[PDB]
Ligand binder design. Structure first.
Ligand SMILES: [Mg+2]
Length: 459
């Protein structure tokens, strides 16, 4: 039986790799979004070589102390998430999960020896993200839904309130999951046909049928990169598959001005594209077919819709004709992408993939009891594993370190908690206490954050 697994993370910071998760919540439903089973909610204990971003703690109201008292170590934390995510025929989804939550999942799995990718495709599993579904709905078929404005806001809280959906205790994983389910139900109800279209075209194979590179056939694309002033929508034309990533296609925004593509050379274009802020400026962008982007046949954007959004159909077709009569453009664009770090092992998930041999060895690591990890006599090819293993043991199984390893771990913490870092931390807390002296609830959270810094980082 196929099902949907709505989930959400509340973290101690903004970086998917460098910050740590605080709380996780997941809810399994059926094809109609009716809850099956019970809600899953648990916390993650923070390791002793990390301090939370104060701003994040003020948002969630979750202190390191609460998380430490209620949660499990990250290895156990990951174990549970991996179980929920590996149930067959599951569509793992959330709200803005493709751009944030999934990166957290990949890093948690990475740090704790689980495959960072398999969960999203094996056993007929797949993934989706309601954020872009809301944007496509607003841009193409607005009717039946109230949209917070002075431009369209797609923050979950705003959408729920604007549509009479009870969303109290926001920024609590559990509550956000319930609100996402509510939003999904709302859209499926008020815009059934668009909903199903987006759903059935989320997978790589159905997306592929829409992309016609040789002909440069136009498509409707919804991306936050286009900007709320255009409804995050435009007409794009695929120019070529990426030279080094066959899961990426180079698209040209037909609504922009293409002269830059005609006048400048590939070196210049590359400089401007590789350093610019991602906001549509060279009218070119990449679409990763494995990240469920919103793509639809051109006619989905009716003349009425174009006018409402401000998209000049004719202008787009004019550029389309030009691109077709100027083969040299396909050359320059592909040439641009024909050319593509940290010393912290936590930030090297994307340094490369692990060979089948290392995956096998890492699998044995997962079955080995912590006490025996040191005694384990396994070969590792990838240089990252050795470092990952040491952090894994020191962070989740401290009592397992020998005397010398404890000294090394102590040295490690000293190198993280440098004088400038502690001063910056105190400066921020000082600034926040001055700003929220009144709010008895916020001051309590700030007091806790300073106490926590005292015990984990002082002396
Ligand atoms: Mg989220």
């Amino acid at each position: 039986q196929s099902t949907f697994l709505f989930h959400d993370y509340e973290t101690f910071g903004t970086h998917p790799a460098l910050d740590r998760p605080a709380q996780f919540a997941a809810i399994r439903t059926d094809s109609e979004f009716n809850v099956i089973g019970e809600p899953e909610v648990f916390y993650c204990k923070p390791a002793d070589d990390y301090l939370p971003q104060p701003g994040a703690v003020l948002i969630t109201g979750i202190t390191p102390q609460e998380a430490r008292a209620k949660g499990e170590n990250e290895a156990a934390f990951a174990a549970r998430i991996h179980s929920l995510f590996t149930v067959p025929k599951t569509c793992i989804l959330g709200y803005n999960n493709v751009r944030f939550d999934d990166e957290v999942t990949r890093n948690i799995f990475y740090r704790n020896f689980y495959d960072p990718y398999a969960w999203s495709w094996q056993h007929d599993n797949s993934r989706w993200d309601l954020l872009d579904v809301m944007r496509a709905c607003y841009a193409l078929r607005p009717e039946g839904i109230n949209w917070p404005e002075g431009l369209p806001s797609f923050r979950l809280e705003h959408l729920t309130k604007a549509n009479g959906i009870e969303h109290s205790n926001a920024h609590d994983a559990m509550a956000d999951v319930y609100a996402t389910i509510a939003m999904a139900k709302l859209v499926k109800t008020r815009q059934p046909r668009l909903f199903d279209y987006l759903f059935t075209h989320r997978n790589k194979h159905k997306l592929m049928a829409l992309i016609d590179v040789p002909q440069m056939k136009p498509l409707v694309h919804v991306s936050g990169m286009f900007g709320a002033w255009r409804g995050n929508t435009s007409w794009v034309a695929p120019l070529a598959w990426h030279p080094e990533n066959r899961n990426a296609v180079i698209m040209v925004d037909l609504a922009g001005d293409i002269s830059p593509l005609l006048e400048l050379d590939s070196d210049t274009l590359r400089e401007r594209l590789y350093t610019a802020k991602t906001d549509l400026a060279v009218p070119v962008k990449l679409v990763h077919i494995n990240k469920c982007p919103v793509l639809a046949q051109a006619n989905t954007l009716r003349p009425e819709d174009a006018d409402r959004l401000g998209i000049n159909r004719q202008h787009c077709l004019d550029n389309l004709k030009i691109l077709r009569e100027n083969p040299q453009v396909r050359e320059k664009v592909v040439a641009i992408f024909a050319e593509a770090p940290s010393d912290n092992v936590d930030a090297q998930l994307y340094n490369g993939f692990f060979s089948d041999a290392d995956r096998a060895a890492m699998k044995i690591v997962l079955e080995t009891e912590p006490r025996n990890l040191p005694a384990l006599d396994i070969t590792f090819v990838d240089k990252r594993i050795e470092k990952l293993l040491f952090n894994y043991r020191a962070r989740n199984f401290p009592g397992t370190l020998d005397y010398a390893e404890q000294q090394r771990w102590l040295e490690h913490r000293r190198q993280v908690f440098t004088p400038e870092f502690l001063q910056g931390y105190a400066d921020e807390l000082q600034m926040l206490v001055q700003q929220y002296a009144d709010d008895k609830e916020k001051v309590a959270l700030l007091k806790a954050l300073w106490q926590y810094a005292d015990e984990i980082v002082e002396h």
